[PDB]
């Protein structure tokens, strides 16, 4: 009856907060005589050291679900990749509190991965919904030659093909480049006037600097950039009038930890009440057998519903990603981020604040412009 729940948070403070949340869930709602146990380990600097420490300190402790977060350190990785891969040899589910990378969305790579935050795919979905509600039919899609950029491009193309719509062209971008002026000139030599860009912070800063000298910040150049492009040097070099996106409660790790603990407890209760549970391996060395109840626990977690969380309705997609998240449509006004609209899911409700556009124009621009230079 004794259960243990592992976790990997950012050192002592978040570990203590996770333990407090575990105790609260033990003393609230479903409260049995022997509910579960709380274990945690800090993110080690070396990925190999982190992987071996997770192995030794969690599999030997009979963990059923392990919570892992991704601290956004720019210089270092500190990614959940080693922990996810170590848990992938078995079928122990993991929860990503703030894993914003789109790599984990594919289950071919990460066999058993879950998270409570839509990495970038639902961000592209919000882009599509905003372009639909604002009547945008001319999109210049700038996509980096990386896995997350390709995934975002594929999702946007699939969403556009739903209504039999297709962008004029999708410019490719290589990370770390500095000669993107040719790509920007190609974008300028197009009928479309709105640009959707998805890149890292340094790439966003570089393309902003390149486009500043090409008169790409004038009237009619609508920008629908994402979250990574309105922070750091990207925010510093971001042209005025950017309609950026910011995820509500996506940075507050404590709320995600509490939601993950609640969902894990509910899934454990459902699994125990459903059928028998196979005991987790005593150690992570010696036994190569795959967990038989691993896929069942994954299905229970994915189908689990948590309406008492801080984000209201909490549910998982077929890829183990948060569905119907709260996105805030941010706007840049006088080099300051001004929140305008909130994305509650399949609905966009702008507030009374007026959305400004690049070039200082007050009226809403349009992507429909006739070149009148038909070659």
């Amino acid at each position, epitope marked *: 009856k004794i259960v243990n729940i592992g976790a990997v948070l950012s050192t002592r403070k978040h570990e203590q907060m996770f333990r407090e949340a575990v105790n609260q869930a033990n003393k609230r709602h479903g409260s049995w005589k022997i509910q579960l146990n709380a274990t945690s380990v800090t993110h080690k600097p070396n990925a190999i050291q982190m992987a071996l420490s997770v192995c030794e300190d969690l599999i030997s402790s009979q963990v059923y679900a392990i919570l892992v977060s991704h601290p956004p350190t720019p210089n270092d990785h500190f990614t959940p990749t080693p922990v996810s891969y170590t848990a992938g040899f078995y079928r122990i589910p993991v929860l990503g509190l703030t894993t914003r990378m789109s790599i984990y969305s594919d289950k071919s790579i990460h066999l058993s991965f879950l998270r409570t935050v839509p990495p970038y795919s639902h961000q592209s979905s919000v882009w599509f919904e905003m372009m639909r509600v604002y009547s945008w039919n001319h999109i210049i899609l700038l996509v980096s030659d990386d896995h997350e950029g390709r995934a975002a491009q594929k999702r946007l193309e699939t969403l556009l093909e739903e209504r039999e719509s297709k962008a004029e062209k999708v410019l490719q971008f290589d990370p770390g480049t500095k000669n993107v002026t040719a790509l920007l000139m190609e974008a300028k030599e197009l009928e479309a006037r709105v640009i959707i860009l998805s890149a890292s912070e340094d790439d966003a800063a570089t393309v902003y600097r390149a486009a500043a000298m090409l008169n790409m910040t004038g009237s009619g150049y609508v920008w629908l950039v994402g979250e990574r492009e309105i922070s750091g040097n990207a925010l510093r070099y971001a042209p005025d009038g950017i309609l950026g996106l910011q995820l509500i409660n996506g940075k*507050n790790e404590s709320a995600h930890i509490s939601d993950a603990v609640g969902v894990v407890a509910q899934a454990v209760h459902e699994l125990l009440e459903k059928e028998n549970i196979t005991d987790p391996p005593r150690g992570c060395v010696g036994n190569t057998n795959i967990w038989k109840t691993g896929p069942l626990f994954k299905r229970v977690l994915m189908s689990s519903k948590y309406a008492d969380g801080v984000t209201g309705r909490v549910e998982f997609n077929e890829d183990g990603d948060r569905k119907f998240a709260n996105y805030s449509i941010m706007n840049l006004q006088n080099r300051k981020l001004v929140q305008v609209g909130i994305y509650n899911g399949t609905h966009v409700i702008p507030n009374d604040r007026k959305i400004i556009w690049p070039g200082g124009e007050t009226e809403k621009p349009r992507g429909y412009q006739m070149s009148t230079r038909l070659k």
Partner: antibody
Framework: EVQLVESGGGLVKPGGSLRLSCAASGFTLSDYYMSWIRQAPGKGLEWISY????????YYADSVKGRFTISRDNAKNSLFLEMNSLTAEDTAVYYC?????????????????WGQGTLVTVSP | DIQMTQSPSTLSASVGDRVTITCRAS??????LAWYQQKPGKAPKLLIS???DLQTGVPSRFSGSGSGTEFTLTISSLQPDDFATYYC?????????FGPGTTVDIRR
């Protein structure tokens, strides 16, 4: 300009009360977390209090727990710290600084920017 | 609590030389550490975040390194405006504590 100004310091007899006002300029106070840190002369720096954006999560240092009170006025963009039961060891230079848990992840502070600071002296 | 020890307490170096400051924590704090520069009579200013990331508006000569229990701050070229007191502060767990501090002096 993003600058902070400390005001309200002075000489207070032991056992009295004093209030410190931190002025926020160049940015909105409701968008960042604030914290008070004092620097005893001839000693290191010691973080004292922490106030969250929502105004409901308040944490005090164990050394001065139960004696200090921290309040914020988002509309006024000013920070107010209340000190009680001042002692000789409380004589330190108090600085109010801006945290970074909003833009960055939780727990990331690296307090910046720092105001010019004020000197609080306790002597009978 | 977390105890940070800085050795040496004081050091002297000439202009243009490389200065190494060692910060050692009692426990393991991964990479959660920050560096401040404090002038006499002036409030400290942040230099390095996450023990390796250079802050905006700070000269590139400042660069940190190390992780876990030992940390190192390195200045590529010492300058007259770099002579101050440096504190390594960790934000691993509450309460947030600052190191004793290291002051850069002039070797004559």
């Amino acid at each position: 300009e993003v600058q902070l100004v400390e005001s309200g310091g002075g000489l207070v007899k032991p056992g009295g009360s004093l209030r410190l006002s931190c002025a926020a300029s160049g940015f909105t106070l409701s968008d960042y977390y604030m914290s008070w840190i004092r620097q005893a002369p001839g000693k290191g720096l010691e973080w004292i209090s922490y106030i969250s954006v929502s105004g409901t999560k308040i944490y005090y240092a164990d050394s001065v727990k139960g004696r200090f009170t921290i309040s914020r006025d988002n509309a006024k963009n000013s920070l107010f710290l209340e000190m009680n039961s001042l002692t000789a060891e409380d004589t330190a230079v108090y600085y109010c600084a801006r945290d970074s848990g909003s833009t960055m992840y939780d727990g990331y502070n690296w307090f910046d920017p720092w105001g010019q600071g004020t000197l609080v002296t306790v002597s009978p | 609590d977390i105890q940070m020890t800085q050795s040496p307490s004081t050091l002297s170096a000439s202009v243009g030389d490389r200065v190494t400051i060692t910060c050692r924590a009692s426990q393991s704090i991964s990479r959660w550490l920050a560096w401040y520069q404090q002038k006499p009579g002036k409030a400290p200013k942040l230099l390095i975040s996450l023990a390796s990331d250079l802050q905006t508006g700070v000269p590139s000569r400042f660069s940190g390194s190390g992780s876990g229990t030992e940390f190192t701050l390195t200045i590529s070229s010492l300058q007259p405006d770099d002579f101050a007191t440096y504190y390594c502060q960790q934000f691993d767990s509450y309460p947030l504590t600052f190191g004793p501090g290291t002051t850069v002096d002039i070797r004559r």
